[PDB]
């Protein structure tokens, strides 16, 4: 197929009014800017990503649609731990620490609340923090990364 | 003279009461828990700290006390870029950002202000960020540190 740009998002229509093939993409793949993928009802479709988004395809990004048929990225349930701060001084410990290990971060909905995926470790920094925080399988969207620009590798 | 816990700390009383000397160190020395200095009037005076401050010690943090003389810590000047966040989002990007180059990192007085040495490097990634800073002679008091715990593998 060889699709070099985005259609849109499913978020920009009502998606029951379509029917809609997916490529499902996990969470740690999204930066992928040029690969083969085969759909969720196997078709083969290729990447060549002009501009892809810095932060990796996000959930809705539609690849290709014609009439009402939409193929679109989904990004698969991961296990995460869902973390929620009380306080600025919270916020910045933890996305520091969180920083200091090159673990993914990912803003929530409340600019106190955050996810990343879930590691023993950093459970277990979490709990020494005293920090709330609980364990659940989500969806860890790109649109939501916290980016890192200029990383020791 | 071996130093094994801290008395209290200056803010607690009025040092223009007592005679005191310092033991100056660079805000990269506070954490430090078997050491030994020598303080500005020339006395030796080494630490063994069976139970260190978890941040490392402060500015005014008393090594020794009789009578009207006291010994304490004071942290130097040095050259730090002071941070000014517009809103929690962007503190959680400076902060994480930070983190990933390991580089110290301090609150100041605003929750929105925080601190970091200077090294240019860093003044590069915020500049890039688009965030508010300016590089002022200001002291890290390790009490404000943000601190990295247990253990943490970087593959
Ligand atoms: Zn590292």
Redesign the pocket.
């Known amino acids: 197929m060889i699709i070099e740009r985005l259609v849109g998002n499913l978020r920009d229509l009502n998606p029951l009014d379509f029917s809609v093939d997916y490529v499902d993409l996990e969470w740690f793949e999204t930066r992928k800017k040029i690969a083969r993928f085969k759909t969720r009802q196997g078709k083969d479709i290729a990447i060549r990503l002009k501009d892809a988004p810095k932060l990796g395809l996000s959930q809705g990004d539609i690849l290709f649609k014609e009439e009402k048929e939409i193929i679109a990225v989904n990004i698969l349930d991961s296990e995460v731990i869902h973390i929620q701060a009380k306080s600025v001084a919270e916020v910045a410990k933890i996305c520091y620490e969180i920083g200091?290990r090159?673990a993914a971060l990912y803003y929530g909905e409340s600019q106190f609340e955050f996810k990343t995926p879930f590691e023993k470790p950093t459970l277990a920094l979490l709990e020494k923090l005293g920090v709330q925080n609980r364990v659940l399988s989500s969806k860890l969207d790109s649109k939501e990364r916290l980016t890192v620009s200029m990383?020791?590798s």
Do not use: L, T
Request: hydrophobic share 0%; aromatic share 0%.
């Open positions: 200091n090159h990383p020791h």
